[PDB]
Amino acid sequence: SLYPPPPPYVKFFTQSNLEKLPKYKEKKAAEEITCALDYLIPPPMPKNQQYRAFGSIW
C-alpha cells in the first residue's frame, strides 16, 4: 500500500477532546505543542511566503 495512512494527529480527535476545546481556546487567549488539545487547532502560517502557491494544478 503506497497509499499513506492519515496523519498520526488523528488519534487526538476524540469527541471528549472536542468538548474540551472551547474552554481550552479561551484559556489559551489568556512549534509550541504541550498537550493533546493543541492538535485540534490549526498550525500557524509560516513566515516564508514560499508556501504561497505558485499556481493551480487541476
Binding site: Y3, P4, P6, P7, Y9, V10, K11, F12, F13, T14, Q15, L18, E31, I33, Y39, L40, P42, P43, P44, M45, P46, Y51, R52, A53, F54, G55, S56, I57, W58
Partner: protein, 92 residues
Amino acid sequence: QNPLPTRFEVELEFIQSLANIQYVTYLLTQQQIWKSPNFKNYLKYLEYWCNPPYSQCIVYPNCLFILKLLNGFMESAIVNEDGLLEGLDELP
C-alpha cells in the same frame, strides 16, 4: 535531504492528496477509520485550509471541493457496525 515535515507541512501535503479520487476512494472503503469518529472529525478540522491565509497555499484546488463534498456526505452518512460506510456498499 530535508528534516522531517512540520505539522503544517504534513497537513498541507495530506489535504492535497485528497485531490486524487482513487485515494479518497481507498479511504472511503476502509474499515477501521470509520469505526471511530476520529477521522471524520479530522476531515472537518481540515476545512481550515478553505480560508485565507491557508487556502493561498493550496496548489491542488480540487482537494478543497472534494473535502467539502466528503465532509457533507459524512454528516448524514450511515456507518455500518464494522466500519463499512453504508451508502457505498453496492460499489466496489
